[PDB]
Design a protein around this ligand. Structure first.
Ligand SMILES: [Zn+2]
Ligand SMILES: [Zn+2]
Lengths: 137, 137
Protein backbone atom coordinates (compact mmCIF):
# COMPACT_ATOMS: atom_id res chain seq x y z
CA UNK A 1 0.00 0.00 0.00
CA UNK A 2 0.98 3.66 -0.21
CA UNK A 3 3.12 5.46 2.39
CA UNK A 4 0.19 7.99 2.67
CA UNK A 5 -1.91 5.13 3.92
CA UNK A 6 0.66 3.85 6.33
CA UNK A 7 0.91 7.31 7.80
CA UNK A 8 -2.92 7.45 8.06
CA UNK A 9 -2.77 4.07 9.87
CA UNK A 10 0.04 5.28 12.08
CA UNK A 11 -2.05 8.20 13.23
CA UNK A 12 -5.07 5.89 13.83
CA UNK A 13 -3.11 3.40 15.86
CA UNK A 14 -1.86 6.26 18.06
CA UNK A 15 -5.41 7.49 18.54
CA UNK A 16 -6.83 3.96 19.11
CA UNK A 17 -4.16 2.87 21.56
CA UNK A 18 -4.59 6.02 23.65
CA UNK A 19 -8.40 5.37 23.84
CA UNK A 20 -8.06 1.73 24.56
CA UNK A 21 -5.33 0.44 26.96
CA UNK A 22 -3.90 3.00 29.51
CA UNK A 23 -11.55 7.86 39.35
CA UNK A 24 -10.17 11.05 37.56
CA UNK A 25 -10.44 10.39 33.70
CA UNK A 26 -7.82 13.09 32.73
CA UNK A 27 -7.39 14.07 29.06
CA UNK A 28 -3.98 14.15 27.47
CA UNK A 29 -4.18 17.91 27.46
CA UNK A 30 -4.72 17.90 31.17
CA UNK A 31 -1.93 15.40 31.80
CA UNK A 32 0.46 17.51 29.74
CA UNK A 33 -0.56 20.65 31.62
CA UNK A 34 0.23 18.83 34.83
CA UNK A 35 3.57 17.64 33.26
CA UNK A 36 4.63 21.20 32.36
CA UNK A 37 3.43 22.68 35.69
CA UNK A 38 5.32 20.00 37.68
CA UNK A 39 8.60 21.62 36.61
CA UNK A 40 7.74 25.37 36.82
CA UNK A 41 4.85 27.70 37.56
CA UNK A 42 3.30 28.96 34.27
CA UNK A 43 0.45 30.98 32.95
CA UNK A 44 -2.47 30.01 30.82
CA UNK A 45 -0.69 31.65 27.87
CA UNK A 46 2.75 29.95 28.51
CA UNK A 47 0.83 26.62 28.57
CA UNK A 48 -1.04 27.36 25.41
CA UNK A 49 2.18 28.29 23.60
CA UNK A 50 4.17 25.35 24.96
CA UNK A 51 1.40 22.87 23.92
CA UNK A 52 0.33 24.83 20.81
CA UNK A 53 -3.40 24.78 21.56
CA UNK A 54 -5.85 27.68 22.12
CA UNK A 55 -5.84 29.72 25.27
CA UNK A 56 -9.49 28.77 25.53
CA UNK A 57 -8.69 24.99 25.43
CA UNK A 58 -6.19 25.64 28.24
CA UNK A 59 -8.72 27.66 30.33
CA UNK A 60 -11.22 24.85 29.91
CA UNK A 61 -8.69 22.10 30.94
CA UNK A 62 -7.56 24.17 33.91
CA UNK A 63 -11.13 24.79 35.18
CA UNK A 64 -11.80 21.03 35.19
CA UNK A 65 -8.47 20.44 36.94
CA UNK A 66 -9.18 23.04 39.64
CA UNK A 67 -12.65 21.38 40.02
CA UNK A 68 -10.87 18.03 40.69
CA UNK A 69 -8.56 19.61 43.27
CA UNK A 70 -5.55 19.09 40.97
CA UNK A 71 -4.32 22.72 40.58
CA UNK A 72 -4.45 25.93 42.49
CA UNK A 73 -4.06 29.37 41.02
CA UNK A 74 -2.32 32.32 42.65
CA UNK A 75 -1.95 35.77 41.15
CA UNK A 76 1.38 37.48 40.58
CA UNK A 77 2.23 40.19 43.14
CA UNK A 78 3.75 42.68 40.64
CA UNK A 79 1.02 42.23 37.96
CA UNK A 80 -2.47 41.31 39.05
CA UNK A 81 -3.61 40.37 35.53
CA UNK A 82 -1.32 37.32 35.70
CA UNK A 83 -2.28 34.02 37.23
CA UNK A 84 0.20 31.19 37.84
CA UNK A 85 -0.88 27.63 38.33
CA UNK A 86 0.67 24.96 40.38
CA UNK A 87 0.01 21.44 41.39
CA UNK A 88 -1.77 20.55 44.61
CA UNK A 89 -0.36 17.67 46.71
CA UNK A 90 -2.99 15.33 45.35
CA UNK A 91 -1.80 15.95 41.69
CA UNK A 92 1.87 15.19 42.28
CA UNK A 93 1.67 11.38 42.26
CA UNK A 94 -0.64 11.61 39.21
CA UNK A 95 1.79 13.80 37.37
CA UNK A 96 4.86 11.70 38.36
CA UNK A 97 3.32 8.57 37.02
CA UNK A 98 2.42 10.13 33.72
CA UNK A 99 5.97 11.54 33.54
CA UNK A 100 7.41 8.11 34.25
CA UNK A 101 5.35 6.47 31.47
CA UNK A 102 6.76 9.15 29.06
CA UNK A 103 10.28 8.25 30.25
CA UNK A 104 9.69 4.60 29.53
CA UNK A 105 8.31 5.32 26.09
CA UNK A 106 11.49 7.34 25.29
CA UNK A 107 13.45 4.09 25.69
CA UNK A 108 11.08 2.48 23.31
CA UNK A 109 11.75 5.16 20.77
CA UNK A 110 15.57 4.81 21.43
CA UNK A 111 15.49 1.10 20.72
CA UNK A 112 13.60 1.61 17.54
CA UNK A 113 15.79 4.42 16.31
CA UNK A 114 18.86 2.20 17.03
CA UNK A 115 17.90 0.03 14.04
CA UNK A 116 18.83 2.82 11.63
CA UNK A 117 22.31 3.94 10.67
CA UNK A 118 23.09 7.55 11.52
CA UNK A 119 22.74 8.33 7.79
CA UNK A 120 19.25 6.86 7.87
CA UNK A 121 18.48 8.90 11.02
CA UNK A 122 19.11 12.26 9.27
CA UNK A 123 16.26 11.36 6.98
CA UNK A 124 14.13 10.11 9.84
CA UNK A 125 14.80 13.49 11.48
CA UNK A 126 13.90 15.39 8.39
CA UNK A 127 10.68 13.32 8.17
CA UNK A 128 9.52 13.70 11.81
CA UNK A 129 10.32 17.38 11.68
CA UNK A 130 8.16 18.16 8.62
CA UNK A 131 5.40 15.82 9.75
CA UNK A 132 5.18 17.53 13.15
CA UNK A 133 5.07 20.98 11.44
CA UNK A 134 2.30 19.84 9.23
CA UNK A 135 0.24 18.15 12.08
CA UNK A 136 0.59 21.39 14.06
CA UNK A 137 -0.57 23.79 11.28
CA UNK B 1 17.20 17.77 20.95
CA UNK B 2 17.11 13.99 20.52
CA UNK B 3 15.04 12.19 17.87
CA UNK B 4 13.48 10.20 20.82
CA UNK B 5 12.11 13.49 22.05
CA UNK B 6 10.85 14.61 18.71
CA UNK B 7 9.00 11.34 18.39
CA UNK B 8 7.55 11.84 21.91
CA UNK B 9 6.44 15.34 20.79
CA UNK B 10 5.03 13.96 17.57
CA UNK B 11 2.85 11.56 19.49
CA UNK B 12 1.73 14.37 21.86
CA UNK B 13 0.82 16.74 19.08
CA UNK B 14 -1.32 13.99 17.51
CA UNK B 15 -3.05 13.40 20.83
CA UNK B 16 -3.46 17.15 21.57
CA UNK B 17 -4.77 18.07 18.14
CA UNK B 18 -7.36 15.29 18.21
CA UNK B 19 -8.61 16.55 21.66
CA UNK B 20 -8.60 20.15 20.68
CA UNK B 21 -9.81 21.26 17.20
CA UNK B 22 -12.16 18.81 15.31
CA UNK B 23 -24.52 16.38 19.83
CA UNK B 24 -22.93 12.83 19.48
CA UNK B 25 -19.29 13.08 20.92
CA UNK B 26 -18.00 9.91 19.09
CA UNK B 27 -14.57 8.46 20.00
CA UNK B 28 -12.05 7.66 17.32
CA UNK B 29 -12.70 4.00 17.95
CA UNK B 30 -16.34 4.51 17.23
CA UNK B 31 -15.69 6.59 14.13
CA UNK B 32 -13.35 3.91 12.79
CA UNK B 33 -15.92 1.21 13.50
CA UNK B 34 -18.41 3.23 11.50
CA UNK B 35 -15.72 3.69 8.75
CA UNK B 36 -15.11 -0.08 8.45
CA UNK B 37 -18.84 -0.95 8.65
CA UNK B 38 -19.69 1.61 5.93
CA UNK B 39 -17.95 -0.62 3.38
CA UNK B 40 -19.00 -4.15 4.56
CA UNK B 41 -20.96 -5.89 7.29
CA UNK B 42 -18.54 -7.25 9.96
CA UNK B 43 -18.51 -8.93 13.30
CA UNK B 44 -17.25 -7.75 16.61
CA UNK B 45 -14.20 -9.99 16.10
CA UNK B 46 -13.47 -8.79 12.47
CA UNK B 47 -13.58 -5.21 13.88
CA UNK B 48 -11.31 -6.00 16.75
CA UNK B 49 -8.77 -7.64 14.42
CA UNK B 50 -8.97 -4.91 11.77
CA UNK B 51 -8.45 -2.15 14.43
CA UNK B 52 -6.17 -4.27 16.68
CA UNK B 53 -8.02 -3.54 19.92
CA UNK B 54 -9.76 -5.92 22.37
CA UNK B 55 -13.03 -7.57 21.56
CA UNK B 56 -14.25 -6.02 24.79
CA UNK B 57 -13.31 -2.46 23.65
CA UNK B 58 -15.28 -3.18 20.45
CA UNK B 59 -18.34 -4.52 22.38
CA UNK B 60 -18.27 -1.41 24.53
CA UNK B 61 -18.02 1.00 21.52
CA UNK B 62 -20.79 -0.87 19.72
CA UNK B 63 -23.17 -0.76 22.73
CA UNK B 64 -22.79 3.03 22.92
CA UNK B 65 -23.31 3.28 19.16
CA UNK B 66 -26.48 1.15 19.24
CA UNK B 67 -27.64 3.37 22.18
CA UNK B 68 -27.19 6.45 19.91
CA UNK B 69 -29.15 4.83 17.08
CA UNK B 70 -25.98 4.60 14.95
CA UNK B 71 -25.82 0.79 14.33
CA UNK B 72 -28.16 -2.11 14.20
CA UNK B 73 -27.20 -5.72 14.70
CA UNK B 74 -28.67 -8.70 12.88
CA UNK B 75 -27.69 -12.32 13.41
CA UNK B 76 -26.41 -14.58 10.67
CA UNK B 77 -28.98 -17.08 9.35
CA UNK B 78 -26.56 -20.05 9.02
CA UNK B 79 -24.82 -19.48 12.41
CA UNK B 80 -26.77 -17.90 15.22
CA UNK B 81 -23.66 -17.20 17.33
CA UNK B 82 -22.64 -14.55 14.78
CA UNK B 83 -23.84 -10.99 14.81
CA UNK B 84 -23.21 -8.54 11.96
CA UNK B 85 -23.43 -4.82 12.40
CA UNK B 86 -24.45 -2.21 9.98
CA UNK B 87 -25.05 1.46 9.86
CA UNK B 88 -28.47 2.98 10.38
CA UNK B 89 -29.55 5.82 8.04
CA UNK B 90 -28.71 8.38 10.68
CA UNK B 91 -25.00 7.16 10.84
CA UNK B 92 -24.31 7.39 7.12
CA UNK B 93 -23.74 11.16 6.88
CA UNK B 94 -21.64 10.96 10.06
CA UNK B 95 -19.51 8.21 8.64
CA UNK B 96 -19.16 9.89 5.19
CA UNK B 97 -17.87 13.06 6.71
CA UNK B 98 -15.31 11.29 8.82
CA UNK B 99 -14.27 9.32 5.71
CA UNK B 100 -13.95 12.54 3.73
CA UNK B 101 -11.71 14.16 6.38
CA UNK B 102 -9.45 11.03 6.16
CA UNK B 103 -9.33 11.49 2.36
CA UNK B 104 -8.26 15.08 2.74
CA UNK B 105 -5.57 14.20 5.24
CA UNK B 106 -4.17 11.63 2.74
CA UNK B 107 -3.42 14.55 0.41
CA UNK B 108 -1.66 16.23 3.22
CA UNK B 109 0.50 13.21 3.73
CA UNK B 110 1.11 13.02 -0.11
CA UNK B 111 2.35 16.58 -0.23
CA UNK B 112 4.66 16.02 2.65
CA UNK B 113 6.04 12.78 1.32
CA UNK B 114 6.67 14.55 -2.05
CA UNK B 115 9.52 16.49 -0.42
CA UNK B 116 11.63 13.33 -0.19
CA UNK B 117 13.42 11.57 -3.02
CA UNK B 118 12.28 8.00 -3.61
CA UNK B 119 15.55 6.87 -1.98
CA UNK B 120 14.64 8.88 1.11
CA UNK B 121 11.12 7.35 1.03
CA UNK B 122 12.43 3.76 1.40
CA UNK B 123 13.84 4.83 4.72
CA UNK B 124 10.70 6.73 5.64
CA UNK B 125 8.84 3.50 4.86
CA UNK B 126 11.16 1.42 6.93
CA UNK B 127 10.69 3.94 9.79
CA UNK B 128 6.87 4.16 9.72
CA UNK B 129 6.65 0.41 9.43
CA UNK B 130 8.73 -0.35 12.55
CA UNK B 131 7.19 2.51 14.50
CA UNK B 132 3.67 1.25 13.79
CA UNK B 133 4.69 -2.31 14.85
CA UNK B 134 6.09 -1.00 18.04
CA UNK B 135 3.05 1.30 18.85
CA UNK B 136 0.79 -1.71 18.25
CA UNK B 137 2.65 -4.19 20.51
ZN1 LIG C 1 1.13 11.99 27.87
ZN1 LIG D 1 -10.51 9.00 12.16
Amino acid sequence: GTLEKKLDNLVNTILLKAENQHDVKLTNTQEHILMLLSQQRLTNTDLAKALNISQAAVTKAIKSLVKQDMLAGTKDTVDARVTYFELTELAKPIASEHTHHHDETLNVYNRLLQKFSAKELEIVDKFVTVFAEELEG
